[PDB]
């Protein structure tokens, strides 16, 4: 298996860039977890489903993001354990 891709400016930090790609944005964006992302890059870490402006996202105590349906396992609220 192979991978290895780069291109992330160190300099030029005035505008806003999707945290996930470091590329500059111009149109609409989403804000959560005190970060910034392209409207196409705010997704459940594990499953990759794109979250939209209203779909229930979930945050973790660490740099991670999940969907409300699946973060359900990390909380176990109405379950036994
Ligand atoms: Zn992006
Ligand atoms: Zn999910």
From Swiss-Prot:
Record domain LIM zinc-binding: where: 18-70
Q: How is it modified after translation?
A: Phosphorylated on serine and/or threonine residues by ROCK1.
Localization annotation: Cytoplasm, Cytoskeleton, Spindle; Cytoplasm, Cytoskeleton, Microtubule organizing center, Centrosome
Q: State the source organism's domain of life.
A: Eukaryota
Give the family per the record.
Belongs to the protein kinase superfamily. TKL Ser/Thr protein kinase family.
The subunit structure is: Binds ROCK1 and MARF1. Interacts with NISCH.
What is this protein's function per UniProt?
A: Serine/threonine-protein kinase that plays an essential role in the regulation of actin filament dynamics. Acts downstream of several Rho family GTPase signal transduction pathways. Involved in astral microtubule organization and mitotic spindle orientation during early stages of mitosis by mediating phosphorylation of TPPP. Displays serine/threonine-specific phosphorylation of myelin basic protein and histone (MBP) in vitro.
Q: What is this protein called?
A: LIM domain kinase 2
Which organism is this entry from?
A: Homo sapiens
Q: What is the name of the gene encoding this protein?
A: LIMK2
Q: Which residues of the full protein are shown?
A: 62 to 129 of 638
């Amino acid at each position: 298996g192979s991978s290895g891709s780069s291109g992330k400016d160190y300099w030029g930090k005035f505008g806003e860039f999707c945290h996930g790609c470091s590329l500059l944005m111009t149109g609409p964006f989403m804000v959560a977890g005190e970060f910034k992302y392209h409207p196409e890059c705010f997704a459940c870490m594990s499953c990759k489903v794109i979250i939209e402006d209203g779909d229930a996202y979930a945050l973790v105590q660490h740099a991670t993001l999940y969907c409300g349906k699946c973060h359900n396992e990390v909380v176990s609220g109405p379950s036994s354990g």
